[PDB]
């Protein structure tokens, strides 16, 4: 599509394999915003929107959060607090006819907005000067960009990892739809309601989350840890000492509570 | 779904001149750009010049400049093509031809064939 | 100016065994920035491959291109009945295109 009216394709309810993009070569730049292009694979979620319009390697550098110029405020404007990123490769074999592409054009504006409409005789619309007989960096490229929102419903796209059967009772590193921890797994009786997956306690804390292929309720409770204090009569006296452990049942390795 | 249909063929005496015209349908003729090619009986193609139909902005040949002039009706979606003092070996079916999914080669039209 | 030649003319073949066609270029041109071309008798010249690697819609597998810099070479695995035809090179990678003389391939 244009940059005036870029496509708006929704992704979800897959599995994504995000190492053959990554690995490929026949991208022309691989810049990422958010995540890592290597670790995009483990991590899950909600929903991708793929942002889809041709540009130029001049001012191509405007696809980037916060970002002015004549099509970063009249045409594309990414927010400022942007969780996605954005891949370019060139497009000469597809994007590039002979002459001049005037299929393609470009016209401030808020982030993800579109204005597709016409009105000292001046029209707001202009087109492209695609040459395929010129400087390189006005070429037409094609650029797809990926904007991620996180956390906004329950996590549905995500790369192919294997899964494996749960251990209860002991402090595990787990990952479940991309919410990654460290804790104790037990059963609850906090009654859930269906449509409701992980819940967080004050501050930003996740106290209990809904598995997948089971749909059970487990708490997560971290596993028990605490400081460890010495003893100790002095080095003038004897080398024996004592240990102790703040407040928590020592039921893994004299001993008094 | 896309046609284009040329004029008719045309006989002149040398040092004259000729228009041909081209009719366009089915897609938006502002969109893609025109282009002309030459190519005389038994001999090859050979591109002839540009002109957008967004701005009408101007690239012609060194070989052809002086003698040719293309212009285009957007009222109609109908692109035409001037061409001055004619000689004999410029006898050939001229095709009128925008690219359309491809780079270039889309839409060559049905040709003209100016006799000189 | 970059020129082109494509050294057979003419080649006299039985349908069924290999052709090659060749047509080179004078000054380096981009691989991307090409094409290929089949102008049928009487009918408007038809692209066979563009990018000098990739088939256009509709072009049977026999058909292949390849080549970069300045030399560059056709394709054609089985020779059917209707092949016969008229063949043109092309490359737009600075300025004026140049278009090619043809090839003409005989029974």
């Known amino acids: 599509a244009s940059v005036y009216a870029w496509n708006r394709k929704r992704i979800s309810n897959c599995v994504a394999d995000y190492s053959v993009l990554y690995n490929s070569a026949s991208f022309s730049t691989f810049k990422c915003y958010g995540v890592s292009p290597t670790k995009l694979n483990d991590l899950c979620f909600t929903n991708v929107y793929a942002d889809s319009f041709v540009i130029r390697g001049d001012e191509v550098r405007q696809i980037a959060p916060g970002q002015t110029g004549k099509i970063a405020d009249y045409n594309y404007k990414l927010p400022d607090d942007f969780t996605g990123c954005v891949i370019a490769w060139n497009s000469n074999n597809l994007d590039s006819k002979v002459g001049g592409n005037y299929n393609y054009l470009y016209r401030n504006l808020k982030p993800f907005e579109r204005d597709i409409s016409t009105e000292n005789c001046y029209f707001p619309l202009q087109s492209y000067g695609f040459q395929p007989t010129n400087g390189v960096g006005y070429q037409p490229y094609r650029v797809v960009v990926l904007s991620f929102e996180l956390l906004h419903a329950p996590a549905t796209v995500c790369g192919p990892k294997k899964s494996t059967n749960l251990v209860k009772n002991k402090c595990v590193n787990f990952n479940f739809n991309g919410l990654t921890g460290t804790g104790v797994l037990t059963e609850s009786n906090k009654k859930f309601l269906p449509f409701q997956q992980f819940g967080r306690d004050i501050a930003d804390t996740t106290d209990a989350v809904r598995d997948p292929q089971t749909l059970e309720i487990l708490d997560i409770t971290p596993c028990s840890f605490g400081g460890v204090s010495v003893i100790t009569p002095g080095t003038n006296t004897s080398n024996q000492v004592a240990v102790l452990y703040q407040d928590v049942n020592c039921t893994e390795v004299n001993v008094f509570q | 779904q896309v046609q284009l249909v040329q004029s008719g063929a045309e006989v002149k005496k040398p040092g004259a001149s000729v228009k041909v015209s081209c009719k366009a349908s089915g897609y938006t003729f502002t969109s893609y750009a025109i282009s002309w090619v030459r190519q005389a009986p038994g001999q090859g193609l050979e591109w002839m010049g540009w002109?957008?139909?967004?701005?009408?902005?101007?690239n012609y040949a060194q070989k052809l400049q002086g003698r040719v002039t293309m212009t285009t009706d957007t009222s109609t979606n109908t692109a035409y093509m001037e061409l001055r003092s004619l000689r004999s070996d410029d006898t050939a079916i001229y095709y009128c031809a925008i690219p359309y999914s491809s780079v270039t080669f889309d839409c060559w039209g049905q040709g003209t064939l100016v006799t000189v | 100016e970059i020129v082109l030649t494509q050294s057979p003319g003419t080649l006299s073949l039985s349908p069924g065994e290999r052709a090659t066609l060749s047509c080179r270029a004078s000054?380096?041109?981009?691989?991307?920035?090409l094409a290929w071309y089949q102008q049928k008798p009487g009918q408007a010249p038809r692209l066979l491959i563009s990018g000098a690697s990739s088939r256009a819609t509709g072009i049977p597998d026999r058909f292949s291109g390849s080549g970069s810099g300045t030399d560059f070479t056709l394709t054609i695995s089985r020779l059917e009945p209707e092949d016969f035809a008229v063949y043109y090179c092309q490359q737009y990678g600075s300025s004026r295109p140049t278009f090619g003389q043809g090839t003409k391939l005989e029974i």
């Open positions: 000054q380096s041109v981009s691989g991307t920035f």
């Open positions: 002109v957008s139909a967004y701005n009408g902005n101007t």
